[PDB]
């Protein structure tokens, strides 16, 4: 039997049902440890932890945020036994989850999660910093849910990646690992997590108000400030370089996974 730590996310916690269906499978003979987050940074700690214990997956049980933290620190850890990751959706849109077709009945998410076949996916990284493991959406702001934004306006940016060129003005920019953000809909309806591409959607005005590409790395520069959302996380600034980490972590994903080549 595989050992497991799952990584609760503070707010999805009181939730008899996990509660009950951690006592069946710890006792079916199954070590699943628990531990709780309060706060950024937690993540990583609990996956060192789990490192300690050498356990066979680390399990994200959150949304698209918590899947960076627990992704962020899998895949900046030396070593040999790097746990897989798996995952449960307990956000309140697990859009990255609901997108790989992670089971909606919670047992059997579970059961993926631990037992699953881990496969190879990529992660994005932006300014080899910050990571997400689905999308980046950006804009000028300073619309709605559509991209934790308010007021969009048109405005300067020049992008780059393998054989890709734009210069114009722009309302919003995806540049995605997973197909639909926040919400729910597809901003890059091609993507997979392992071609080793990331996809961008350039949306110009308020088919030529689409420009597309796909690369393993994008440079975007512009004047002003570009406001992106990386999985929830804002990043602001003139400068992003985005750069796929092909390969980077090993996820627990059911067999006919809609996002794998």
């Known amino acids: 039997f595989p050992a497991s ?3 609760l996310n503070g707010k999805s916690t009181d939730n008899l049902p996990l509660r009950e269906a951690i006592m069946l499978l710890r006792e079916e003979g199954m070590t699943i440890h628990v531990r709780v987050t309060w706060e950024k940074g937690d993540a990583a700690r609990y996956v060192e932890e789990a490192r300690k214990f050498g356990v066979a997956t680390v399990i994200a049980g959150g949304g698209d945020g918590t899947i960076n933290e627990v992704s962020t620190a899998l895949i900046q850890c030396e070593g040999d036994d790097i746990p897989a990751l798996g995952i449960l959706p307990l956000g309140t849109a697990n859009d990255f989850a609901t997108s790989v077709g992670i089971p909606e009945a919670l047992d059997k998410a579970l059961k993926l999660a631990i037992a699953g076949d881990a496969i190879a996916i990529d992660m994005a990284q932006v300014n080899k910093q910050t990571c997400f493991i689905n999308m980046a959406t950006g804009g000028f702001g300073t619309i709605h849910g559509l991209m934790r934004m308010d007021t969009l306006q048109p405005d300067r940016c020049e992008i780059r ?40 959607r350039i949306f110009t005005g308020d088919n030529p108000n689409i420009i597309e590409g796909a690369s393993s790395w994008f440079d975007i ?7 992106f959302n990386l999985d929830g996380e804002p990043l602001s600034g003139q400068n992003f370089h985005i750069e796929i980490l092909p390969a980077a972590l090993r996820c627990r994903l059911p067999p006919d996974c809609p996002l794998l080549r």
């Open 161 to 200: 990646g393998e054989n890709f060129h734009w210069q114009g003005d722009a309302l919003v920019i995806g540049i995605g690992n997973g197909r639909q953000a926040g919400g729910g809909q597809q901003l890059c309806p091609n993507a997979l997590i392992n071609d080793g591409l990331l996809q961008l």
């Open 221 to 227: 520069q512009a004047p002003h400030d570009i406001t």
């Open 5 to 7: 730590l799952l990584i």
